[PDB]
Amino acid sequence: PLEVDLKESGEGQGGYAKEMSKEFIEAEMKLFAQQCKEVDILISTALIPGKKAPILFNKEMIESMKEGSVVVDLAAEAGGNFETTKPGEL
Amino acid sequence: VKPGIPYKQLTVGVPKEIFQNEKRVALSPAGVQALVKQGFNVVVESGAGEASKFSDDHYRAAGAQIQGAKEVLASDLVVKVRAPMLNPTLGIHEADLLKTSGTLISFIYPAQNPDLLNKLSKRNTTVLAMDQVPRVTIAQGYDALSSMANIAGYKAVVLAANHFGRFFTGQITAAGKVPPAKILIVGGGVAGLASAGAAKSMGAIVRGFDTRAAALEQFKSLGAEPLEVDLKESGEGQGGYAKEMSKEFIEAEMKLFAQQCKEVDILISTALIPGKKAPILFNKEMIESMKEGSVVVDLAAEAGGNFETTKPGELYVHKGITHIGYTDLPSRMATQASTLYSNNITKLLKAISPDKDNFYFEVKDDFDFGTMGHVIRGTVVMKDGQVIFPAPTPKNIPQGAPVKQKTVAELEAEKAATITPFRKTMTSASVYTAGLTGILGLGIAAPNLAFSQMVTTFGLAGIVGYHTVWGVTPALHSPLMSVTNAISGLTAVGGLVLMGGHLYPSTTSQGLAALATFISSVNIAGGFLVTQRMLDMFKRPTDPPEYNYLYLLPAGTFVGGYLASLYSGYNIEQIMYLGSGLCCVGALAGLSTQGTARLGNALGMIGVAGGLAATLGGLKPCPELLAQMSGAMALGGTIGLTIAKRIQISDLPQLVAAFHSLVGLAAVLTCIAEYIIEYPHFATDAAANLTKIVAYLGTYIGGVTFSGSLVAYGKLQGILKSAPLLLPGRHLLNAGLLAASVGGIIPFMMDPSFTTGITCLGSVSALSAVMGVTLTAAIGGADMPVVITVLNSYSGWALCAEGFLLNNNLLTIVGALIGSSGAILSYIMCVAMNRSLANVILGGYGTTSTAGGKPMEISGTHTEINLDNAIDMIREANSIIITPGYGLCAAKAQYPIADLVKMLSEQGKKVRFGIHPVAGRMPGQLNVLLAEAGVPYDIVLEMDEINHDFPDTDLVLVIGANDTVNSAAQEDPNSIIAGMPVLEVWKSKQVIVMKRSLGVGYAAVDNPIFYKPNTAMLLGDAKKTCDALQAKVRESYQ
């Protein structure tokens, strides 16, 4: 289990999540840009009820990976967790 | 001159492949860092590793030089992944682009390509073949076909799924039972076992099959279901391979596969025989009977196929059951294939010329099997154009001859199975009838009722002492030793009741009693201070604050409860003896948890104080004689307190050897004294013979204990030489001394004179002292801790001889409690090695499991490293087990080891200690020295508790131990330590052994784990190297 250095309650009304603050999203993207240079596969399943999926990876954050990585996006219907995802193809 | 051309003038080359849809490359950049470390110059074609996903920047940063396409094949070494062929881009064949005296490293397949060998022979080159390396033991680090078979098996599994439209695992959720998938694997070689592992770990169940008898055991070890066929004929294929089976075996195997084919879901076939096609094992009607949507993978599609329906390279659906039939399967995992093939080529070129700045690889045909000339001649298929492909046979055949020696437990099995069930019951009934007739013999010889009551409390206290000292923790065996030495200072009880007169002694018996009280108070005070000092070093700094002064509350009302009754007209001494005996039992019983260990010192203090108070108040001494008693106990206690405080803990065995002599001497000084004070009463007594038997035996036991412990102290301290001084005739001398000592009780009876009795007492004391010096000086300085414990039992039983004599219950309870402790510690120590007490004391060669002579020889050479590779290999690990010995503590190396373990546990590692039961100069010494260093007791484990954690361990540091880690105890029945339980450190990943020089230990002339490939030597003194490791971990991480 990873961790960020901001203590914000992620829950909303029930078991579902809610929208995060801009500073929390920036700190989470700092964590993901830190550990995006070490992993080989990454699977993003982030999906917030009520609106579209949060963008969590820049187009320059994902090009810093190794030559040959696989990036799977399970939120391609309701937006996506990447600003580089054609929503139906490889 | 060295007959090779140097590394600087040569150049390897990595071309790209013009073969269709080819993706893997010949060398990864990890194989370009190597061979530049070795000395070659590397040139790489521009577009070479993009399909294998290796950019040109990594080849530039590895030391190579990106260059074109014509001047890469024109190199001294040419390294390909497959054979040269027609190049339609340049319009010329690649063999015409090579230089004259080049060298090619490729899959050649010379039995199938004669025109390639013709075109290479016209260019006058030397061609090595990665195909034709034979499958032997020393050439399994470079076996390209096994690597490609492993990758093909994993890729066949991961291509079975993503075309199979159900789960493999199967879960029980609250939405419906889903069953696991069922996968059948025809033929387990490398690809079959890779597929079985990849399918079993993912979740499915495997029911594979092979014709050889070993591959079914490999299937059962991987966890599959080995299938059997009814026609039971031999698995052919001499050399460890498979031939072509008979027709009836094939039509029975196809019946088995047709029965199993209706119910499995994925069928991976890997059947392949050498020099022929793959056998057709599945018909069309056999494979159309599967469930719709099944996946059928064919791994033998290059050499024929195992199916009547396989298009080699397509995925046609064929009424549901999808066929996968790719012929270039490792090319779809080209990164892993390129890395493993680069490792195979690098480990080939590191091995065929193991020399600096020369490159030779002599090709000769003398053909010693197993050696490397076999590998060199079998690999090279062309040398200077003249083809040498049919390799002649190796001369001898090792590696397949069963001559294998059994292990030592397998030789112990025929001893454990040759004892008939009649003789076990016969010797058990013999032991019990001997015990019962000995009880009857003690019954007949009883003069009075007090002897029978005292034998009853002796037997019960012996059983209590037996059960209570197996319960103690093996980490606290030396505080147990110290507690028994403190409680054995109750020979002052025997001194106070024979101590009479006034402020000074009057007669000689009253001076012997004063001497006994003096040295026993030395024992009491010294033992309780060293116990309290040793039990305060196990105290962790994160433990809760304990309040030991609250145990002044029972003591203050026990002896304070005594005197208030003593100032009342009551006599409570026979019950105060029981209470003191129970408190001394609880002193040893509480020393069994590590949370109750400080209770086990306080209860012993309460017991000794209550015993001395009872024997001091049941005499009613006059105020000048009580002053003499208190002065003797105060001076002895003062000397004991000032000795037990200045010592180091590493000098603790000597002090223990210094205590039993003061228990022995006092015992002698009691017994002779009670021969003097009760000599004029032997006329009018019926028990006049019992009190002389017991006096004689107590004098003998004390005289042995005194002199033996004195020689033990002299040989532990360094005064006497630690070599076993052997007299010319020593067994005849010892038997004559024992015969004189036993036969001297016959002049001691049958004569009521005083001069005869006192000269028999003096003679048995002198003969017992001479026997102690004679038996102790023939032992040797390493098994001297036996003499510490055996005499620890004798200093117990002398107390019983002081309790039978004075008619005192507390002395017999305490003496049984100490004798059982010493006997059980010496048993644990004799069974921790594999020697008997007659083997240690009398002197015997080796071990009671050795056999014959000629221990087996040593094989190989030792790997030796320095501080930097050792510290880098510590940093790679994530679970370390340290096995310390006496060399760690003789060099005072436990303090930087404790600081190093603390630093490595601050960084999330798992660093534990493993202790052998006879590592040290005393039972449990090494636990206390690690506790003094500062190590918490929960990461220090015994041998039995850590022994099954060695295969799942990244690193083992062996610091100053040789015999306790020696593998020849488990696999050489002729060894001097054969059968001794040892710390099996060889079963881990890596072992660093730190010692001064490659020599011996105390026995076992050479250690076979030092000459083992998973063991690196780090020579040097332990103090310097441990300080160096501490400084490097400190200065690399902080």
Ligand SMILES: CCCCCCCCCCCCCCCCCC(=O)OC[C@H](COP(=O)([O-])OCC[N+](C)(C)C)OC(=O)CCCCCCCCCCCCCCCCC
């Ligand atoms: C004070 C109120 C009245 C009570 C009077 C009762 C009669 C006298 C009984 C004395 C025996 C001890 C009582 C039970 C234990 C008490 C708790 C305790 O000691 O905790 C460890 C406590 C606390 O230990 P610690 O773990 O805090 O370590 C600190 C250690 N020192 C204090 C030395 C720096 O330590 C001590 O009390 C001192 C060290 C242990 C004793 C060392 C000398 C032993 C001498 C022989 C023992 C006595 C034999 C009998 C001879 C006659 C004695 C009068």
Ligand SMILES: CCCCCCCCCCCCCCCCCC(=O)OC[C@H](COP(=O)([O-])OCC[N+](C)(C)C)OC(=O)CCCCCCCCCCCCCCCCC
């Ligand atoms: C004034 C009163 C005086 C009273 C004196 C009372 C003396 C009581 C003596 C008690 C000790 C008895 C020892 C029996 C040992 C039996 C062990 C055994 O089973 O061995 C077979 C075993 C066979 O190996 P094993 O590994 O199969 O062990 C047996 C295990 N079971 C039973 C489960 C199968 O031999 C050994 O292990 C080798 C070593 C044996 C000896 C080890 C030391 C024994 C203790 C000696 C201490 C000193 C004695 C002092 C005597 C004093 C006399 C005055």
Ligand SMILES: NC(=O)c1ccc[n+]([C@@H]2O[C@H](COP(=O)([O-])OP(=O)(O)OC[C@H]3O[C@@H](n4cnc5c(N)ncnc54)[C@H](OP(=O)(O)O)[C@@H]3O)[C@@H](O)[C@H]2O)c1
């Ligand atoms: N503990 C007991 O209660 C007890 C009882 C009876 C018998 N024993 C005996 O105890 C032995 C224990 O065996 P073991 O393997 O632990 O001991 P070992 O083989 O005698 O010694 C271990 C090795 O440590 C090395 N060493 C010694 N001093 C060193 C130092 N200052 N620095 C670095 N290395 C040092 C020595 O090798 P180099 O000098 O070659 O470098 C020595 O061979 C048993 O074999 C048994 O015979 C013990």
Ligand SMILES: NC(=O)c1ccc[n+]([C@@H]2O[C@H](COP(=O)([O-])OP(=O)(O)OC[C@H]3O[C@@H](n4cnc5c(N)ncnc54)[C@H](O)[C@@H]3O)[C@@H](O)[C@H]2O)c1
């Ligand atoms: N270090 C070592 O000991 C080591 C290393 C590498 C290889 N090897 C040996 O080399 C072989 C490795 O296997 P491989 O995959 O490389 O060879 P392979 O490609 O020839 O394997 C084909 C497999 O199919 C089996 N088979 C043949 N005919 C069959 C039939 N009619 N029905 C069912 N199964 C049939 C064979 O027994 C074999 O297991 C083994 O014999 C192994 O012991 C040993």
Ligand SMILES: CCCCCCCCCCCC
């Ligand atoms: C070994 C235990 C004692 C054996 C005693 C045998 C009989 C002695 C008789 C002595 C005269 C009554």
Ligand SMILES: CCCCCCCCCCCC
């Ligand atoms: C002749 C009478 C002998 C009485 C004593 C026999 C031996 C008893 C030994 C008891 C243990 C020390």
